[PDB]
């Protein structure tokens, strides 16, 4: 369907891709945001490119170097007194917020945004990663935490830094998220304890031993509130009190995952990527469809691509951004949630016989 190769010998991991419409456009047509271990932030919007045996121009819209490592980018509402969306960018020793503004110049590489740094925030420690959420129960806006490398929580409100405490049970930094419904900071240390500290200004609330470490934590609700944790070998689904709803044992080893939208009540769909270039879609434990990939993903998101829903982006660690290669029809795990150029040739052909010039082949 579409491909590109970005940069040269630049590395990436998870947290270096999102999919939203940060410029607060009325049509809601979401845009790609790509970080790097250099500062080479891109913003994409791949136009529908047909099978015409050519490379279409102006694939990139803007590119701003920051000459610094970009750990993890985040979209969200990060200016008080407005409901706009603002890209938040983390460096290894500094924290930035770039309010996006669409320039006077239009499409085909007119530098669609200039980097309007609203407020840089100095760092006391170097960080691992971070997340965003309306902590405390405020409406409209969303605040920003910081997990340090040695591990401590520096919460930042849009006006200023709020307060700081250390993270107990630390031996090595793990992933981290904030639950919206149960208003707690869900993390997992290196001692295999999935923990959830209370937001209040430490003693643990409730722990759970899960057997191993975990790459990524995601929390969605649609209503059913459910905490998902993909471990190194297994794959959990936690209830809010600390109940394992179900599990699944993986013989392979996963790379990145994302529990996007559902099709039925109670059901919720999940995508997993192997290291054997295989993708797996998943109703809660029930496998549904699984087809190959050109490479090993390191992050996956799901957004809208030019008013088409059910889009799958596959960012690697080299610079690949090949997306949604139309297995049978580029749809969600719902029963054909979108056609999205479903008109094509075929899928899963039958005959494997050559039957051509086999006579007189001696």
């Amino acid at each position: 369907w579409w491909s590109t190769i970005l940069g040269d010998k630049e590395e990436f991991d998870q947290g270096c891709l999102c999919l939203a419409n940060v410029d607060n456009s009325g049509n809601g047509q979401d845009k790609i945001i790509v970080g790097s271990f250099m500062g080479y932030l891109r913003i994409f919007s791949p136009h529908p490119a047909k099978t015409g045996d050519g490379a279409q121009a102006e694939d990139l819209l803007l590119e701003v170097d920051l000459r610094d490592p970009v750990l993890q980018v985040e979209v969200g509402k990060f200016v008080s007194g407005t409901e706009m969306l603002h890209l938040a960018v983390l460096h290894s020793r500094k924290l930035c917020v770039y309010s996006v503004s669409g320039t006077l110049g239009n499409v085909e590489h007119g530098n669609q945004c200039q980097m309007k740094l609203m407020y840089e925030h100095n760092l006391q420690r170097t960080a691992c990663n971070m997340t965003y959420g309306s902590f405390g129960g405020v409406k409209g806006r969303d605040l920003i935490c910081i997990q340090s490398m040695d591990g401590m929580l520096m919460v930042f409100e849009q006006e200023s830094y709020a307060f700081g405490r250390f993270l107990p049970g630390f031996l090595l930094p793990g992933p981290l998220a904030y639950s919206s419904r149960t208003d707690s900071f869900l993390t997992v240390s290196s001692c295999q304890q999935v923990e959830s500290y209370k937001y209040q200004v430490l003693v643990v609330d409730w722990t759970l031993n899960i057997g191993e470490q975990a790459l990524d934590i995601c929390i969605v609700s649609f209503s059913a509130s459910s905490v998902f944790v993909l471990g190194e070998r297994n794959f959990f689904c936690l209830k809010d009190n600390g109940q394992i709803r179900f599990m699944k044992k993986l013989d392979w080893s996963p790379s990145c995952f994302l529990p996007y939208c559902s099709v039925s009540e109670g059901t919720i769909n999940t995508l997993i990527g192997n290291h054997n270039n295989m993708l797996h879609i998943y109703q809660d434990v029930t496998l549904k469809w699984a087809t190959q990939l050109p490479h090993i993903p390191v992050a996956v998101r799901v957004g809208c691509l030019h008013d088409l829903k059910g889009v799958i982006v596959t960012l690697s660690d080299d610079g690949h951004l090949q997306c949604s290669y139309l297995g049978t029809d580029p749809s969600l795990f719902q029963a054909p949630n979108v056609q999205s150029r479903e008109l094509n040739y075929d899928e899963l052909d039958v005959e494997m016989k050559e039957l051509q010039k086999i006579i007189k082949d001696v």
Partner: protein, 50 residues
């Protein structure tokens, strides 16, 4: 009718590939069977051989 001629010309390489690998070992006499001096030869690693 295409299937019949597909079998013969694939089997015709099979007789050649077998005999070219048969005579490759018969002249070297790798087989544990003989005709002139008429014994076979079986051999094994025993349990105490560890």
């Amino acid at each position: 009718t295409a299937m019949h001629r597909a079998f013969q010309t694939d089997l015709y390489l099979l007789r050649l590939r077998a005999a070219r690998a048969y005579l490759q070992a018969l002249e070297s006499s790798l087989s544990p069977l003989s005709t002139t001096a008429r014994e076979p030869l079986k051999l094994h690693a025993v349990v105490q051989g560890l």
